With several copies, the nearest count.
Chain A
Amino acid sequence: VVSHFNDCPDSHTQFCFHGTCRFLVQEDKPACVCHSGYVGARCEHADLLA
């Protein structure tokens, strides 16, 4: 089963502020997983409408 996901490489570590990084491999780009209550491409801001 093709992973489609693998651990975030040691070049974008601490790249994610309020979430856990991960490397979706198909297009060679990382992607956070924000916690409940944080929006933003890098898990930067807090969703004030909550």
Chain B
Amino acid sequence: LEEKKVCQGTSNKLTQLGTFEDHFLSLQRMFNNCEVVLGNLEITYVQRNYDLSFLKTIQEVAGYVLIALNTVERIPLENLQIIRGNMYYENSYALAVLSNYDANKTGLKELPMRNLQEILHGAVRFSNNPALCNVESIQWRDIVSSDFLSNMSMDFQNHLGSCQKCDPSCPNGSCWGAGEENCQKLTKIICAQQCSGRCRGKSPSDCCHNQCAAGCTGPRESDCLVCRKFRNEATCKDTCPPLMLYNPTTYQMDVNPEGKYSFGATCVKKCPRNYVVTDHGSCVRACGADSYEMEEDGVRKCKKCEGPCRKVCNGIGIGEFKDSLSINATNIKHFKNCTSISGDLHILPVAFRGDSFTHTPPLDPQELDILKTVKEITGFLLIQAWPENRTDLHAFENLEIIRGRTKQHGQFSLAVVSLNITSLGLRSLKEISDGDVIISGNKNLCYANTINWKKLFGTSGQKTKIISNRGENSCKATGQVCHALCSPEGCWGPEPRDCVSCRNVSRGRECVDKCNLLEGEPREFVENSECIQCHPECLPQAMNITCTGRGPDNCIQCAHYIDGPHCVKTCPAGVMGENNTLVWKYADAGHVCHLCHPNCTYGCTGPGLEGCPT
């Protein structure tokens, strides 16, 4: 189908993930059955005699390509067509091939990237691999973009024996391997003199479209091999078709019958329901500093800010927190009073233990309470270390929505791994709009799967992974099942104030089985199954109820004077009225006060002027 299988790539630079045959497994796990790498493509520490045959299906790399200290003889990356270079290794390059020999001058000899034809951004570095040969004559100005040819480093010193040749059926002995197919096919420095782009022949009759990125198979925009900027359903456009076009005839606007939303690198019909939709038509992650998000009739938009244009806080890995790992004790003050993290929160053990490499002093676990005002996170939440004295996620008792725009390892939106906390304790979570949920490795944590997680999610295809916690059959032993009040729905904790739906009534924010309807000072009512108390000055009766409403009127009788349908401790004795009069109101036997005579303004005990001494 027209959806090439994608992967997430790696971001290890030179790190080895265990033993030589435990690194290759992690390599095989991520890159097997791949067609479009969305991240990077690291192939490092792949020792002799391993079968890297799964690479013959990769066709793009939307980052860089790093081939580190391998020893295998041949890497079958003979289908790579383009390296978009969205992220540079060493801040300069987008294809690095470094030191592919173990210790004694043997190892990687062949590397037949015969289809590689374009590198949209970044230079290329070869260095220090004295076994790779026949990549020594490739004209590197046909592949690299014409801008970066000043920043390319190349060092070919294949001084290990010799190797085969490549016949003169290819341009001036420029070959990628040894054979007929493994030799370069130029498309940029053989073109005609009237096509500013790629080509497929030494003629103006077959110059390619302006939007083809590696070389066309036809002289149109629907025949490009790899699209350069966008992709409008098998047509490599330049900008997605707008929603409203100008009208030169009438100086007005119109509506495009075919207008799509710009979702990242493709023209989609409608933005995903958890992305900010601007007016132009664009799935923005978090719109401008001025505007502020606000839910429309089923979708999210954002409008301008009037008066106070409140601050927004960037998460980790973006903004001024570009190369920060956790919320360490040098950027926690920047979260002083946030209510929405326009990003994603990483908490790692380096936050507490404190680092020495990048001069970062340790954290005070009391400072972690500043997060108690956060109300929603647009990206994801990755918790990896908590104060051990703590028994629950206390700093997040107000978290309400995890949007799930940025994700961890491209899959997870809520990760709680390897923690020492007895109960999860997010007693205000409502919706995890997108992503997955992993909660594993908590050696003593009971309440993880009692919650019906299938109703916090809001998008089809969301799974949950909850293993290796404290076994359920042990929570039953030590008497740790949640309270008898919480409905059979879930319980974020043992306390009654931590349920998800109180079975009968909820006094404030804690579950109870019966409001006080006859006894107890707070004689309340069960409106909306929430015990709500009334005016204290209402008469308490042991047989009948006290009140049926917050207003001081619904009460049967009153503990003090009554003024018509409403009663209060004392009836008017100098209150303000209408037309600038001091309204006074004298009492009666049954406490039914009556308005005083308009003469006297001091006191009132009898009807009219019978309570006006001098």
Contact = CB atoms under 8 A, between A and B. Distances in A.
A and B touch in the complex (CB under 8 A): yes
Interface of A: 1-4, 12-15, 17, 19, 24, 26-27, 29-36, 38-50
Contact of A49 (B12, B18, B411): B411
Interface in B1-58: 10-18, 22, 26, 29
Interface in B325-375: 325, 348-350, 355-357
B145 to A, nearest CB: 25
Contact of A48 (B12, B13, B349, B409): B409
B79 interface: no
Interface string B380-422: 0010100000000000000000000000110110010110000
B103 A4 contact: yes
> Which of the listed residues B22, B127, B417 has the most CB atoms from chain A within 10 Å of its own CB?
B417
Please report whether the interface of chain A is mostly helix, strand, loop or mixed according to DSSP: loop
Contacts of B128: 26-27
A41 B13 contact: yes
A42 B325 CA distance: 10
Contact of B415 (A15, A44, A48): A48
Nearest to A33: B16
Contacts of B325: 42, 44
Nearest to B10: A39
A12 B60 CA distance: 35
A31 B357 contact: no
Given A4-B102, A14-B357, A48-B415, A34 B14 contact: no
B526 interface: no
Contact of B12 (A14, A30, A41): A41
Nearest to A35: B18
> Which of the listed residues B12, B355, B438 has the most CB atoms from chain A within 10 Å of its own CB?
B12
A34 B103 contact: no
Interface of B: 10-18, 22, 26, 29, 69, 98-99, 102-104, 127-128, 325, 348-350, 355-357, 382, 384, 408-409, 411-412, 415, 417-418, 438, 440-441, 465
A39 B12 CA distance: 7
Contact of A19 (B15, B29, B69): B15
A5 to B, nearest CB: 9
A42 B438 CA distance: 22
A31 B438 contact: no
A26 B349 contact: no
Contacts of B408: 45, 48
Given A39-B12, A45-B408, A48-B411, A34 B17 contact: yes
Contacts of A4: 69, 99, 102-103
B411 A44 contact: no
Contact of B11 (A24, A26, A29, A41): A41
B13 A31 contact: yes
B16 A31 contact: yes
A16 B356 CA distance: 11
Nearest to B441: A46
A17 B382 CA distance: 16
Contacts of B409: 45, 47-49
Given A29-B14, A41-B14, 6 more contacts: A1-B103, A17-B348, A26-B128, A32-B15, A34-B12, A48-B465
B438 A48 contact: yes
B15 A31 contact: yes
A29 to B, nearest CB: 6
Given A14-B356, A14-B357, A26-B128, A40 B11 contact: yes
